[PDB]
Design a protein around this ligand. Structure first.
Ligand code: HEC
Ligand code: HEC
Ligand code: NI
Ligand code: NI
Lengths: 106, 106
């Protein structure tokens, strides 16, 4: 799956979570988001073709995915506690990660 | 000044940026926030009062301030280039840094 497929999976499932009202719905959507984030985690965007792996910009780009995956994981644990509304609030806070990386790197 | 003082400074000046009557007040508020962030990085938050300086939690807490300072610096550069509306827009995005760290540790 390419970067665009992964990003639309992230986009759509954020809205599934908002639309949802039970724990299984939120868990399933976060699980889909986690897989999409992990899929996109390790590859290079266009605007960073000629960059070392440890260069500051690539470092921060990959750090963005790592941190998004951590907070998807944290939202998943709340869904697994049956804490639907907390997990929904955590998922909404994920939008910060989306915009931060986009403003840097897209 | 303690961590509560620093957070007041951050809260008041982030509002000042949103409400600034002139472009110069934006830069002044960013400058005060930068100092507040670096001071706060030297404190121990109450919810981590038992953790060693080497804990993963204290690491993420300190790192949040570095990243906040980095984006403050980006906004300062914009304000210093005369792109003060762009600086003000960037400053509004700093709220994500507040929300993220608070979700963990406030
Ligand atoms: C970097 C660390 C990113 C994070 C975190 C997120 N996104 Fe992203 N996204 C990124 C890039 C570099 C790109 C452009 C890729 C390209 O080749 O153009 C994108 C793109 C999108 C898109 C566009 C989809 C399309 O069909 O064009 C969307 C809808 C999108 N990203 C959404 C999105 C969401 C909802 C995120 C957080 C939950 C998110 N992205 C994180 C880089 C990064
Ligand atoms: C961690 C990396 C943080 C960042 C970035 C920001 N804040 Fe924060 N804030 C943090 C903690 C650990 C705490 C709890 C402090 C305590 O002693 O309990 C807070 C608290 C606040 C508060 C309340 C302060 C109080 O007197 O109780 C405010 C008003 C606040 N924080 C504001 C704020 C803003 C606007 C930030 C972004 C610009 C911001 N903080 C960043 C940790 C962190
Ligand atoms: Ni975090
Ligand atoms: Ni950044």
């Amino acid at each position: 799956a390419d970067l665009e497929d992964n990003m639309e999976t992230l986009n759509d499932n954020l809205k599934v979570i908002e639309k949802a009202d039970n724990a299984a719905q939120v868990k399933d959507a976060l699980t889909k988001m986690r897989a999409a984030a992990l899929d996109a985690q390790k590859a290079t965007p266009p605007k960073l073709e000629d960059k070392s792996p440890d260069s500051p910009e690539m470092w921060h780009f990959r750090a963005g995915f790592d941190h998004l995956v951590g907070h998807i994981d944290d939202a998943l644990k709340l869904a697994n506690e049956g804490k639907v509304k907390e997990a929904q609030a955590a998922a909404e806070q994920l939008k910060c990660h989306c915009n931060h990386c986009h403003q840097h790197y897209r």
